[model samples]
Target chain A: ALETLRRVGDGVLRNHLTA
Target chain B: DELYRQSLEIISRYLREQATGASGATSRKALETLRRVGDGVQRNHETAFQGMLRKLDIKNEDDVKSLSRVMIHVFSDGVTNWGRIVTLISFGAFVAKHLKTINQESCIEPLAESITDVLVRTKRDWLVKQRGWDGFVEFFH
Candidate 1:
């Protein structure tokens, strides 16, 4: 996820950002 | 996910893409779409088929109409719901991981292939080009 993500179901890369 | 998602590379690329005067909006919107789930979905915009309904002389209804119909028509007498804890924790995981996605990320190839879908599906031409049976089989059998 760029500054991303989604409703959820976010892609793998977005999780790294969340972490 | 609406966090201003971007690659370090993309942040830099934005200046170039903006200079080219392309609609950087998809990237903008998708980034927003990823992270922000509006508290209320503006049902009007969500129902893109409303005007098509007018053209096709179909019916229309408010928010849950389509979902209700789909539930009746397309599903069994059952439901799907995740438990509460996993639901709470789901975003945290995606937040940490979604960045690893890139041109090589999952579904990138599917998106690349979808360009042909767009060209062919223009005005349902792809449906004609592939034929329903062939198109279904292309994805399924």
Candidate 2:
């Protein structure tokens, strides 16, 4: 579950940072 | 759910004020730290979540509720901490942003409410022990 959340958070941060 | 209400109220108000370019530096700093902490986690985890959502295909309110149930399970597992709390709210922000992109912005409130429910159900005692948002700020500060 923590891993799932890490991916979610990483994906969002990557999107936010790139956009 | 009163503590959950209070907790979500604080987060909602901060997000709302933040959108208007209003909100204090301290809280804003805390939010940024939380995001940074979230981002610092290793990215080796498989994209099971996004895949699960895609497989389920979020096309309606029911789909959103289904997503909320998944969130509840993820959050309820294992130990509760400020780091986990940060991850939870960060995921909520991600979902809200995704809904906006898909022109389903109206679903954000229900999503937020669902998140509130998850936290209340799973982390209520921890939140009370930490003194809620005040503890969040202090921990991140």
Candidate 3:
């Protein structure tokens, strides 16, 4: 679960950067 | 407190065997929701709080007693993005409002657990069942 959240966090950061 | 107890028990059990591993935006959003509702109730925002629950038809079935079924009612009856979390915690506060004891520490524990699990389910539904990840956070749209 921790790993999943970390992946989700990374995704969010990447998405935000592209935005 | 019987109705309140019943509802939480059902929702908690619903998550008992599910994917409630504490991940994603949904988890943090869920946490924020609980805090907001608790703050609202403490600040006497009764009208707005009850109004949200009433939209879910909670008051009409106040005696239904079988709360496991209530989540179906809540989700089925038009609860959306932030409204979904709002309606949930408002309902919790509605029932919690009538309790005789008023012990915030112990009183909030079960609900916090239940909402966390429920939010995991909500996010899963949104990501997998609904459209899913690429456009998952559709704030711009």
Candidate 4:
């Protein structure tokens, strides 16, 4: 769960930087 | 569900506002990316909402208020210049993961309402635009 969520978090941050 | 919509709505508007200075093509991409990102946030939110509130022990108004305050603070505390936008969503990931056991919707519904209220109220100030992405690298790095 933590792993998946952390990956999700990375996506969230990635979207922010890229967007 | 409503709270999720409201949060995403606030984010959608803010992201659009930030794309103002870009070229037309870039702006379109930004808006589209932001829309998708906003949807991801809502998706994770729907899954994580009650579980996180329960794990954090957000039962009463006081707990809800505190959680809300911390969220507001985490964004504005000057640690990450973009923390307001980035961290809120990033933290959601952890909250989603930390949700080990399912919780009662009825028990956590009020907390969710209060949490949404904070998100709306905080974003309504419209200050992040003024804050800008100027110190972003410096603050976060």
Candidate 5:
């Protein structure tokens, strides 16, 4: 279980910039 | 008050901050945005101070609370090039920073920090959804 939550900043970064 | 809470057009309060598509000039846009963010931070600091003064309470809870509300209310909606791009705000937000834009000018990089902060603030409902739904709610918030 993910004890903490993450907003996937890296994914968003990749998507926001490249996609 | 960073939020003053919303001191009459704090985002691009100055006429110069906004760029018309005709002008379509991307001059210091990133820095200009950073400056607004800096101002927003300053405003939040002020809001915290005013809150302390008015509420007669010095606590960190309001700090977090105010930021959450403001991120949803203001930061998510903060974009100057909206009207010019799509003639609609949501379209403006959705299509921000297109890699290959129609015009040489673009309002890319809308709000990573703010968006990140927002998602972090509301990740409970958004983190798992890998679809447009998560992004869609941002407008509503």
Candidate 6:
């Protein structure tokens, strides 16, 4: 479950963290 | 305190709305299913779930927004099933707990809204086919 969350978290950061 | 009950009611109302075309029996079953799932997670997985929430760094409204978006993406990516649904709501409970710890309890209602929004939006037909939480109780009971 944490792994799934890590992937989701990473994807969120990647997609939404633009300056 | 009563956070569990509060959260359960919030999610249950949205679920009842989703099943408005059906009988009240399904909504009651759905409420029970959600309560059981929430209780099971609180009993067995609280520590690990809270740890997971900490990793997400959800300390403010912006983080909450991102977390909700992530939840939507997570639900959208998977095959709609009891397991995923359980995880999503369980995680939402943990998120509420985390928010309370940080003195942002106001976010809990909105968080529940976002969780159920993804749920009904993405899985309404599947959820209906599952007989509105009967399958969930059978799956995990």
Q: Report DockQ per prediction, comma-separated.
A: 0.03, 0.13, 0.03, 0.10, 0.03, 0.05
**Top lDDT model:** 6
Give me the runs in candidate 4 sitting further than 4 Å from their true place. Answer: A1-15, B1-5, B8-62, B78-83, B86-102, B127-141
What candidate 5 gets wrong by more than 4 Å, as runs, is A1-19, B1-29, B36-58, B74-115, B119-141
Q: Which one wins by lDDT: 4 or 5?
A: 4
Estimate, for each residue in B32-93, the C-alpha lDDT of model 6 and write its tens digit.
76666555654565676667676788888888778877766665445455656666776776
Docking class of 1: incorrect
- The runs of at least 3 residues in candidate 2 whose Cα sits more than 4 Å from the true structure, single-residue gaps closed, are A1-3, A6-19, B14-56
Q: Provide the TM-score, chain A, model 5.
A: 0.36
Residue pairs with backbone atoms closer than 3 Å in model 5 (clashes): B1-B4, B2-B43, B2-B44, B3-B6
Q: Give the Cα lDDT of each candidate.
A: 0.25, 0.59, 0.38, 0.42, 0.28, 0.60
By TM-score, is 4 or 5 better?
Answer: 4
Better of 1 and 2 by lDDT: 2
DockQ of 3: 0.03
Model 5, B7-50: lDDT tens digits are: 11222222113333311122234234434333333243444333
**What docking grade applies to model 3?**
incorrect
Per-residue lDDT tens digits for candidate 1, residues B1-141, read 121122222222322222223234444543233223221121212232233233323122221123223222211212211111111122212211221222223322222222222223321433344442233223221
Q: Which ten residues in a row have the lowest lDDT in candidate 1 chain B?
A: B79-88
Q: What is model 2's DockQ versus the real complex? A: 0.13
Name every residue pair that clashes in candidate 4.
none
After superposition, which runs of candidate 1 have C-alpha atoms over 4 Å from their true positions?
A: A1-19, B1-23, B37-107, B115-141
Please write out the lDDT profile of model 3 over residues B40-115, one tens digit for every residue.
4334545654443345332222322333244434445333343344345445545444321233323333543545
Off by over 4 Å in 6: A1-19, B1-24
Ranking by lDDT: 6, 2, 4, 3, 5, 1
Q: How high is the DockQ of candidate 5?
A: 0.03
Model 1 has a clash total of: 38
True contacts kept of each: 0.00, 0.12, 0.00, 0.02, 0.00, 0.02
